[PDB]
Amino acid sequence: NVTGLFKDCSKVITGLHPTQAPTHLSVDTKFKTEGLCVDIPGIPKDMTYRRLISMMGFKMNYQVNGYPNMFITREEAIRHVRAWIGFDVEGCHATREAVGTNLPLQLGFSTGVNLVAVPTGYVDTPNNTDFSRVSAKPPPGDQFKHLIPLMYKGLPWNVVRIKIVQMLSDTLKNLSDRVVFVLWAHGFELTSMKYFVKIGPERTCCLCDRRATCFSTASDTYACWHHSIGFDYVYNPFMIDVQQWGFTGNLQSNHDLYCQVHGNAHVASCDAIMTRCLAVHECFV
Amino acid sequence: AGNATEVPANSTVLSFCAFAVDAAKAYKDYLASGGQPITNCVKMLCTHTGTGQAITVTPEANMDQESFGGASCCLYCRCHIDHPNPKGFCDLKGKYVQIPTTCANDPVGFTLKNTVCTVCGMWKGYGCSCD
């Protein structure tokens, strides 16, 4: 039994040398014997490889003292309805040097914001993991021909995550001490969060007594929505998957049962708007 | 397409440390909360007649150690996150790590917590004869 989390997406037909393989599974078959691995002097390590590692498959069900849970109950999300931000990501597929994973392309929010990112992935090398631009193609189809121009209009992730923190701060400073991302089939959104979210124990703002909602790598500091100027990471966010509330069909068909003012414009932010709208109608009517 | 590298038993701990600001602290706190150690490491079949040094180019396990592939014993390699040393490169990936048999259940945790003696090359408290 295996998972898709950290799946190797390279086109290389061989596995890794026992010293460079992150796991027993990834060790090349030549070295495997009796459930273990052997060192073969004369079969050396590879010092040039670039292997794209998949970020699809995260499971945030940890239970660690002092670490708040990311996924919250419906009743807790209702209490923090002011912090609700709908979130959806339209991705692109890995291509050319790699195949088998999706990378974030357009990030949409119920605020009406759409951010286009450069297709970036986590590429393992003989020394470390390189967070870098990778070859990507928009999903095969005509419902995704709006993404073709976006493949060249993207911003580097260091810029994108700064814009997310700035947008959430401007939207939530006067409404809540938190953010609750409202999702529909959370898988790819949680994958995308790996690019702009950090977690840990609950902290306070460096400039005030309010709980920290942002983090800065540059200065190793924490900030609330009021003092997050220049911050790059969303810290300790909360979320909920509306799809798991017993809905039988797709997002649009369930949203349309209660609301006729949000026509589908087939864009990331439109799905995010529909998700938050559906959550409000379902929870408060 | 693609080849799976992980097993479902590691999904929770790997996802937890993959999102943490301080992954080393997150892993230690995960263990302290009753979490299972990272499994699916590269354990070697060796003679057990090796030098006993901590980090080697070939498996050097003695009768009291188990040899493992270095990248598989590194939390940062396992989570595919930044390494904490200023150059950003790994010291375990590309080498073999000898772990004491009593600590072989959690090789990732062992390397995170322990240090190699710069004089004799053995682990401190687990083979280092120096003072």
Ligand SMILES: O=C1N[C@H](c2ccccc2)CO1
């Ligand atoms: O030759 C091979 N291919 C398998 C593999 C699994 C995961 C990642 C890379 C390669 C193991 O042996």
Ligand SMILES: [Mg+2]
């Ligand atoms: Mg969508």
Ligand SMILES: [Zn+2]
């Ligand atoms: Zn503050």
Ligand SMILES: [Zn+2]
């Ligand atoms: Zn609506």
Ligand SMILES: [Zn+2]
């Ligand atoms: Zn490493």
Ligand SMILES: [Zn+2]
């Ligand atoms: Zn010593």
